Structures are given as C-alpha cells and as structure tokens.
Design a protein around this ligand. Structure first.
Ligand SMILES: Nc1ncnc2c1ncn2[C@@H]1O[C@H](COP(=O)(O)OP(=O)(O)O)[C@@H](O)[C@H]1O
Ligand SMILES: Nc1ncnc2c1ncn2[C@@H]1O[C@H](COP(=O)(O)OP(=O)(O)O)[C@@H](O)[C@H]1O
Ligand SMILES: [Zn+2]
Ligand SMILES: [Zn+2]
Lengths: 640, 640
RNA sequence: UCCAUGCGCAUGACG
RNA sequence: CGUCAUGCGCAUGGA
RNA sequence: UCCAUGCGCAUGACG
RNA sequence: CGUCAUGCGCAUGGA
C-alpha cells in the first residue's frame, strides 16, 4: 500500500503511537492513509505478537458499508479478519464474540456503546477500551457535546486519570489504547473571535485526548493539483390575514407580535398549554387552528399558495371526516364558526391561488441556467414539503421538461414532521440514478449535503438556507468562520507541549466533572414510580378518559387501555392499524393489532394530566417524562 | 419625494455640503426632510460615482425600528440598500461588513462606537468616520456631555484639527464627512441668563462642528397651520415620627435635620458607612431601618399610607423569614428591640391606615375631569411604585370604573430600584392598546414623555413633577427657559462667520484637551492589580467571610467562592437562582446555577473590605472600584 | 423489501 | 429553558 | 417571548 | 464630589 507524500508525513507521528488527529481536505482520500496506519499498527503488534485490534467508527451506516465495500476489505482482504458490522445488517453473532474475533472492525457508534453499556449493566455482555489496542474515528467534528463519539471517549478519559494516579501510587496501571481521529475539518462553533474558536479546538482535542493537530503545510502543491459565488434573483395573503384577525376578535387573542414568524407560533403553543391548563374551548382549540394558519403563511411566503390550499384542504377535509365519524354512532359553536369561516372563502381562495411568488421568480432563474449545459443538478432547502412542492410544480411546468431536465426529490428517513419518509434503499436508488443520468437534478434537504456521494455537479442551488448559486449574506459569515479556524489551527499547532498538556488536562477534568454532575441530577430526576396517581383527559373536552391503574403496557413501550368500560367511549376512523378518535373528534391514537389482540393504543401528546393530588394540568409530549410506572400486561387476564 | 416649503429652505444649505443643524418643532415630520437630504446626497455621490454612505443614529432602539418601518425603507425601498441595525435585533453579519455593504444604515449609537472602539482595540474589527461620507443624527440636544453622540463626534474633531494642520504643512489630508443634525429643540441647560444660554448653544454647535443653526423664520404660516394651563387642587404620620425619635434615643443618633427629606436619608447612609467603618451594631443596623422609615414617610406624604403598611409589611415579614431561616440549621438585642417596637403597633397602624391625603384630593379632581369627555388619558409622576399604587387604588375605586375609565400602568425597563420592570414588548402592547382604546388612561414615569407615540390625549396630568393639568410654579421657569433659548437662537443665527468660527474653534479645542486630561487621570486611576490583598466581611457582624485568593471569576463578570470551607457558613432562602443569606440574616447573594455548577455568587454591596495593609474599612457598591484583579476560574480544578 | 412504534443525538432558525 | 425545521443513530414488532 | 447579570450614559431633586 | 429617583443604551448567560 503505497502512500502519497502529503499523506506520508501527516501519518508519520501516528506510527510512533502518538494519538493524534489527522484532518485533510475532501478529495484527498484520507481512507487509504487510515489503512496504512492500521496495517502498520497491526504489523507492529504482529512483530510484538500482541492483541492487535482496530475498531473503526463512523456515525452513519452508509459510510460503514462503503468502507467495507471499497477500502478496508480490498486492501486487507488477504491478511486479516474484517467485518462490516452495523445495526441494520443482522449479525447472528453478538459483539463480545466479534471482539474475541475479527481483528479488524468497521462498526457504528452506539453499537459499541451499547455493548459497553451492557458491560456496565447486568447483561453480562462485555467490552472495554482495554480490549482494543487502537481506535479510529471519522468526522471527529461531531465530538463536541453529548454525541456518541464523545460519550465513547469520555469513559476512556476517566480511566486515564485513574491510571495517571495509579502510576504515581501503584506499580500496575490498566492498559489504554491509541486514538486516531480523522475529520474533513475540525470545525468551529459559536465563535465570533479567534479566542473562542481556539477554546473550541482545545475542547475537541481534549475530548479526543489527542497530542496534536496535524496538517499538510509542506506538500500543498500536489494537493492543490489534485484538489480544486452568490447569485440572487399577494392579495391572497391579505385575504387570509383578515380572517386571522377576525378570529383573534372571535377569541380575544392578543398576539403581541406579527403574522408569519415562529414567535406567533410559539405564543400559540403557550396559549394552547394554558388553555389545556384551563380545559377551555376557543383557547386551545383556536391555538391549534392558528398554528395551521401560520404554517400556511410561512410556506406561502416561499411556496406556491396552491400548496397552502392543499395543506388546508387536507386539514379541513379531515376535520369534516372527524366530525362526520363523530356523528355516526353534533357540532359545537366553535367548530361551526371556524369551519364555515373557512368554507365560505375556500373556493374563491383557490381562484386567488391560480393567480400569479419566489417560485415563479426562481423558475425564471433556473430555466436560464439550464441552457449553458452531461447535465447534473442539485438543490437544497429546509423543509421536506418544499421538496415535493418543487418537484410537482416543476413537473407541471412544460419548459423544464422541454429543456430535457428530469427532476426527483430526496429527503431523509426519520418518522417525524408528518411527511412520507424516504427509505435508505430508495435513497441509494436515487443517487445511483443521478449517476446513471436518469434524473438530471436532485431536490434535497441536507441529506445530499454530506455522506451521500453526490458529485460532478455544475450547479448547486440553495433555496432559502462548479458554479454556486444562492437564491432568496450567509456566505460571508461562513467564509469568515473558515478563515478564523484556519488561523486557529496554525496557532494551536505552534504551541508549547507543556502548556498544551496543561490546557487539555484542565478541559478533560472539566468534562468529567460535568458528566458526574449530570449523573447526579439525572439520578435525582426519577423518584416517584407510582402505579396510579392520575387521570388522562381529552384536552379539547376536559373529560375523563382513563385512570392510572386501568392502563397496561406492552413491549415495555406502548400503553393501551382494555377494560371495555373505556371502549364504550371512542370512535374509529381510517382512510386511504386503524386510528382512534374522540367523541368530540379529538384524535386519540391507534388500534394496535398485535399479539393476537386489537389493543387500543393511544398517544400522550393528545391527552392531559390530572394528578390525584389535584396538581395543575400538565402536557408532556412523551410518556417517559413522568417517573411514574405502569404495569406490564398479563395475558392470562383478559384471556377469554 | 416632494418637500414641503418650510422644509425646503432649511434643508437647502445641506445640499451644498454644509454640515448644519436642522431644528424643527414636533409634528413637522422632519424625517421626510432627512430622506430628501440623504437621497439627494446619494444622487450627488452617484453623479460623482463615489462612496455614498449614510449612518443614521438614534439613541433609542424604538426610534430606529420606527425609521426602518415607516420612513426610510418605503421611500428608498427601490434604489438603495438599507438595514435596521440595532443591538437587540440579532444580526448574523458583523458591522464592518455592513459598512462594506448596505449603503444606507439606520443604527444606534454605541453599536457604532463599539465598532470604532474595536478599531482602536485589537479586535481587528474596523470602521472610521472616513468610511462614511455623511452622518445623520436625531435628538442632538443629547450631545452635551459624555454622551454617546458626543463621544462619537469628539473623535471626529481631533481628526479635523490634525487635518487642518496637514493642510498647511502637507499635501494630503484625510477625508472627513458631512454632519447633519436634527433636534426638536437645541435645549438650554443651567441657564439663568441669555449669555450662559448662548454659551450652551455654542458648546452644542462645537460638539457637532456645525456651520449654523437653521430654522424656519419665513414660512411660519403653514407651520402654525399644521402645528398647534396649570390647575391645582395625619396622626398616623405622627404615630410613626414618635417611634423614630424613640429609636434615635435608643441609638443616640443626632439627625441635625428633619424627617421627610433626602437630607435625613443621606446622613443615614453616611452613618451607615461609618458604622460599617466601625463594624458596630445599632449604628449601621439602625441606619438601614431609618432609611426604610424615611422612605415610608415621603411616600406616605404623597401616597396612601396603606402602601407604607405594604412597604413595611414586605420589609419586616422578610426580616422574620430571614431570622427564621437563621434559626434553622437566636435573636440579637437590637433586632428584638426594633422588630417588637414595630409589631406592637403594626395592627393599630393598619387601623389608622384605613382612616382618611393628596390621593383623595386628587381623586376628587380627576373624577370631575372625566365627565367632560373618544376618551384618552395620560399621567406622569416620579416613582415606579407610585404608578402601581395609583393603578391599584384607582382600580379599587368604584367611581372611576363607573365612569367607564380604564387605567393601566407603565414604567421603563431597567433592572434597578427594586421594582418589577416592564419589558419593551409589553410597552408596545400598552401603547397599542392606548391606540385601540382598551385603556383610557396611562400611568407613566417619563417613558411616555418622549419616544413612545402617545398622542391625541386631552388631559395630561402631572402629579408631583389639549388641556394641561399640574397637580401638587415650575411651568413658569420652563416658559422662561423656552423664551430664553428662542432669543439665543436668533442671536447666534445673526452672527459673523469669522467670529462664529473663532468661537467654535476655541470650544472644540477645549473639549479635546479636557478629554485628554480625562484619559490621563483615567490611566492613572487603576495601578495595583493585586491577586489577594483583602478580606471580605459581613457588614452587620464584622466577621470574616472570604479571603482574596479563594475568590474566582466567571464570565469575567461575576465573583463566586468555592472551597466549601466557605460553604460551611451561609444559609439559603427562597420564596415565591436562589438567594444566599448570612448566619446573622444579612443578605449575601445568589446561588448562580450555571456552567453545570451551583456557584454561590455574592454582591460586594453587602460586604465590607479589610486590606492586608490594615487600611480602614471601605464600601464600594461595585467590584470595579478597586483596581485589584481576581483570577478566572479553572474548571479542571474542582472538576470532581 | 416494506410497514408501525419507542429512545437518544447533532445542526440551523427563533423566543 | 422552550419552539420549529432538518438530519442521524439505536432498539422493539409486523407484513 | 421571558429571566438573571455586568457596564456606561443622561435628566431631575437634594446635600 | 456624594445621595435618591427616573429613563436610556450596550455586553454576557439561561429558559
Ligand atoms: N496513495 C494514493 N495515491 C494516489 N491516490 C490516492 C492515494 N490514496 C487515496 N487516493 C485517492 O483518493 C481517492 C479516495 O477519496 P475518498 O476517501 O473517497 O475521499 P474522502 O476522504 O472524502 O472519503 C481515490 O479516488 C484515490 O484516487
Ligand atoms: N413633504 C411633506 N408634505 C406633507 N406632509 C409631510 C411632508 N413631510 C412630512 N409630512 C408630515 O409629517 C408627518 C410625520 O411626522 P413625524 O416625523 O412622525 O414627526 P417627528 O418629526 O416628531 O418624528 C407625517 O404625518 C406627514 O403628514
Ligand atoms: Zn374529546
Ligand atoms: Zn452576618
């Protein structure tokens, strides 16, 4: 494995066992350097005939699979054992065993941490930093806060300090391993000065326990050889603002602020809690609606108002279906006022929606772009709904197709925000096509920003965040931060080893003590662990829904209430297991059909608390907040 | 942008580049004139194709936001770049950059000055008056003393004199900009004659470097067209005076003056220092109590004595809680004497408080007022406690409500005087309501006097400071001063340019030299910078509390003492982070829970000094007084 | 290969 | 500390 | 949007 | 120079 020159020197310290960081710009292929380090380290331990383990960590799974596909296996296919361990890829054999085998490991963070947790737990599954003789890391910039990498290294620190004490006062000290670290750039956070930046860097180094930053300040020429702009372009709104003010009047709601910002939203949520802490109507009820309206506003500000019509079409049609289901098996004053207030305008509002708008301006921009140019394309933005809107709206346009441009959307995987997620599989499909050329232009939130191999693209437009385009000042501040961190890197590199040691020791101790304080407060957190002290109520209608003991649990995750005395209440709904809804139409939960039972599960977001102590109403958004505990279900009971 | 006639001529000189002042009465809308000047100036620099910058300054933030909302943007929305820069409104991009962009600037004083300070500092953030080709100012009357406006212009002067010297003895001289200035009225201070007034005016002109005052002495008719009275209305006191004299007897305290004035208070404070310089009891202890009593007196003189009962209820109940906490985890001779001296009367004193009083007289006045009259209302006064008292007392009255009058209070924002402050947000809420009509009558200290848009109000009552009412001679003197400044304006306008120049040059030099003397003395001020030379003692009990080196710092603002040897002392209290209190009940500070630590912060007001040199006790009210310096905290230590 | 659930984390904007 | 948006990782269960 | 802290400034009354 | 009251501005930190 021949090593490029600029890679040679930067690696050189690590071959002496110095636990250093190694930062190199993208495109330099810092992986093959890592292989050189690992292979050399293994050969050194081979010469010593001792336990040579490397446990490489990447935060994302795709990185791990890529490393197992392309870089580590092909180079070390011959000599050593490898395994592309990950959470998703089922591995019949547990981790302690692969620690006893498979000298080399690709892996992913919280798998290792889970195993270490099991060591600290009574699972009897064990692993220690002791067992490894080396660790290798990627994207060290993540190692700042309560991140997984940081949690992994924090345990190692405490052991180091114990070992330092043991050295002075004891013959034996526990072994600890080397720690490499690779990053595209160390990063700088919350810096408006060089000094805060340097402190950040030192924090990172302490977290990694490293001896020094390392860069290539010598062979910059070959690097520049191999490694190689900001362009910037109604009555419907008012029609809706008028209704919002009408509803404030209907509600006596004082915003204290304007329409079309997060501040209005936050006040709406706070009023929603208070009205939930009141069990009143037109107060929480109307906060919910106004949240929808404000979202309609701020998407409208950036999006075709047709999409706001779509948003509220979805919303209000679901409202009709909820009330219609409620009718099956009446309507309140509030709901009638609001719903009719909408429907009286809905049709004309759509007529307004037809009328010509960042989107139109942008089209004028990007169509002009697609004449210059193999065609490649990228887009960024913030929301997942914006991506779909851009995709559909662009599809509707005849000009974009006429140019031959084909476009597809792209978002993450997580199950939040009320959007249809994208699977890992389908992401791979899309990027493979963007390499095939089926789609010329991607639409992405931040997935494409990193990890995914998107490259060779002329245009990278950012809408509201190698030609560069930035539609909508933020580039300037980023440039300033880049300059600031380069200067700080140089400063730290040129520092006294003694002062450097003193500085990092102090930061290490600070981190450890802060964790200990965290643990003290955390242990103090949960104290009650009560079986039944409460009542769950519908939050629109401050109505009794459940008690505390009638509840039960499954999977030690989900909470459901049998005892069909409860079942006499709710209503069921579904369109396209099924969904539960209130006698007032308030959404309650899902009919989880599992374990041979149609368990009526619910979600604590939508309910409100009343302690037996008569303590004030509370809203949590998650069960785990309260420390009280509910029983696990006994199928012998309810067996029937 | 068409310009009104009386505005036309007054502006005319400035279009020639003369750096003049422009004073116009309120209601003339002098902003649109400023726009005309700026736009014309920009168009002139456009014709020259040179750097056209305007940096408008207002002392208050609200003025800036108003200018960005209403006047500059709408008129110049099209051509030029604008930015409503302020301290509160977070601006991701720093100031030097907005100096490199955003041709037009609204701003606020000390932001600019901070940037200029950074230029003089090593921050590397830079800006100069050079960069700007124009400055615009509002409320120039502020530019008298060490005000921000004055500090800003003082730097410019020195550079001007250097440039004057450079002109005679050098080809190149540094560029300097025009300086406009707008004010409602120039103002006159400490004048009992025309001559002192004229000197004041000249001082203002020199500070602004202006060429001339400008007024409209020609188009007064249209002005008067667009621009358009003094009415004036017990045993409880004695009950308390008797106790005060009883306590003098208990203390051998000789006032040398009477009860119910600042003089008694000031002597009380001086005795408090001396008794702190004695470490004695019944001397500082009783000065504190008598300060409370005298405040009770002078509020009582103007306020319902129920509120004095409230004041001392608060005080003595807190005394009980302090001593009760002290008991947890005894009582002195002094405290028992004083407390029982109070409690023996407290109930009957309240009974007296029920008995009918400026307030009652005033009610008889203002109720009569509210029959004449859309209803609008204003009130002025001095204290913040008076506003609350008026609001609650008026609320309790049935007549004021019966008339339909609704009333709300209003005060500033600052965190001083032991009152609940009012946020900017809530001030906007109130004035918006006073425009809506929810509240008919405001109660205000001086906030309403200016800046805030309060208008169209028939009544403006002043209680102890377009019908005018003045409840309680001061109007006469104000009228005299107004006449005196109008005459002086006319005099200065009609003056020789040569003599005018000579006069202002001399004043400019005087100001500069005075600043240089200030800087010399200031540099001479701090000289010691010692780590630990002292001991901090409780001031009631002359007891050791801290040393000098055991102290540490955070934020380079706050001082806390870890080393729980200290922690063995104090006691904690809270009612409704938390508060620290003495083993004798003397208040010490706050348990600042920050950075993952429950740091026990303290306040130097409440402690007393003892140098290692054995120098006499000292009280400072602020840490910064002493030049000695304490270390910044090292979290590595105390990490645990 | 898809679906549902729970948990933890970071980033950005805001208050 | 709270809100929103975004992305990520882990652990359950099912088709 | 709220909270706590530090700093500087001006005004008025007084001594 | 000191005291009180009032108002303002800036800079930190947190929820
Ligand atoms: N010793 C070497 N000599 C020549 N090229 C190398 C060497 N090591 C790595 N490379 C180049 O680096 C590239 C791999 O970069 P990669 O690791 O994908 O980038 P990143 O560091 O962003 O993951 C390869 O295309 C390869 O040509
Ligand atoms: N050229 C003009 N013609 C007519 N009216 C004008 C002109 N310029 C300003 N105004 C009036 O001045 C008013 C603005 O005054 P404003 O600037 O708020 O007062 P202040 O000077 O106290 O801030 C506006 O209501 C407007 O009618
Ligand atoms: Zn309900
Ligand atoms: Zn004490």
């Amino acid at each position: 494995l021949q090593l490029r020159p600029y890679q040679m020197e930067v690696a050189q310290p690590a071959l002496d066992g110095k636990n250093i960081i190694i930062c190199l710009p993208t495109g330099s292929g810092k992986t093959r350097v890592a292989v050189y380090i690992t292979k050399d380290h293994l050969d050194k331990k081979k010469q010593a005939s001792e336990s040579g383990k490397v446990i490489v960590l990447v935060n994302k799974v795709m990185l791990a699979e890529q490393l197992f596909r392309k870089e580590f296996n092909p180079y070390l296919k011959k000599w050593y054992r490898i395994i592309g361990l990950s959470g998703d890829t089922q591995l019949k054999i547990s981790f302690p065993e692969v620690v006893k085998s498979y000298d080399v490991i690709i892996s992913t963070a919280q798998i290792l941490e889970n195993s270490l947790l099991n060591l600290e737990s009574g699972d009897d599954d064990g692993v220690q930093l002791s067992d490894f003789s080396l660790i290798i890391i990627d994207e060290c910039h993540h190692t700042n806060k309560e991140a997984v990498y940081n949690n992994i290294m924090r345990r190692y620190l405490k052991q180091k300090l114990r070992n330092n004490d043991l050295k002075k006062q004891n013959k034996p000290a526990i072994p600890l391993p080397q720690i490499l670290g690779l990053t595209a750039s160390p990063g700088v956070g919350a810096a408006k000065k060089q000094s805060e930046a340097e402190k950040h860097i030192l924090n990172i180094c302490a977290n990694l326990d490293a001896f020094t930053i390392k860069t290539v300040k010598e062979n910059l020429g070959q690097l520049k050889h191999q490694i190689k702009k900001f362009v910037i372009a109604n009555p419907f709104k008012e029609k809706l603002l008028e209704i919002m003010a009408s509803i404030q009047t209907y509600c006596q709601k004082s915003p204290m602020s304007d329409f079309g910002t997060q501040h209005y939203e936050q006040w709406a949520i706070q009023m929603e809690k208070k009205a939930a802490k009141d069990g009143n109507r037109k107060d929480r009820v109307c906060a919910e609606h106004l949240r929808k309206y404000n979202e309609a506003l701020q998407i409208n500000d950036t999006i075709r108002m047709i999409d706001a019509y779509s948003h509220l079409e979805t919303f209000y049609t679901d409202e009709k279906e909820k009330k219609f289901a409620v009718l099956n098996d009446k309507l309140d004053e509030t709901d009638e006022f609001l719903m009719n207030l909408f429907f009286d305008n809905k049709k004309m509002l759509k007529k307004l929606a037809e009328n010509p708008e960042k989107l139109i301006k942008l089209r004028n921009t990007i169509l002009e772009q697609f004449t210059r140019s193999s065609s490649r394309g990228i887009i960024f933005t913030k929301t997942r709904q914006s991506t779909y809107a851009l995709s559909q709206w662009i599809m509707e346009n005849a000009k974009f197709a006429e140019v031959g441009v084909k476009a597809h959307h792209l978002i993450g995987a997580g199950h939040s925000s009320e959007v249809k997620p994208m699977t890992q599989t389908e992401q791979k499909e899309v990027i493979s096509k963007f390499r095939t050329g089926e789609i010329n232009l991607l639409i992405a939130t931040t997935v494409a920003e990193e990890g995914l191999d998107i490259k060779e693209c002329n245009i990278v437009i950012r809408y509201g965040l190698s030609t560069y385009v930035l539609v909508t000042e933020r580039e300037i501040v980023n440039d300033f931060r880049e300059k600031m961190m380069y200067k700080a890197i140089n400063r730290v590199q040129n520092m006294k080893p003694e002062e450097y040691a003193h500085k990092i020791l102090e930061l290490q101790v600070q981190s450890i003590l802060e964790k200990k304080m965290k643990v003290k407060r955390s242990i103090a957190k949960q104290y009650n662990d009560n079986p039944s002290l409460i009542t769950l109520l519908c939050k629109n209608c401050s109505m009794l829904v459940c008690s505390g003991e009638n509840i039960h649990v499954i999977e030690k995750m989900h909470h459901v209430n049998m005892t069909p005395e409860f079942k006499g209440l709710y209503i069921v709904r579904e369109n396209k297991n099924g969904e539960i809804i209130c006698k007032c139409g308030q959404a309650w939960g899902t009919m989880m059909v599992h374990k041979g039972l149609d368990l009526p599960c619910l979600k604590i977001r939508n309910f409100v608390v009343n302690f037996k102590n008569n303590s004030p109403k509370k809203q949590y958004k998650k069960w785990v907040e309260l420390p009280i505990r509910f029983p696990d279900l006994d199928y012998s009971e309810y067996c029937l």
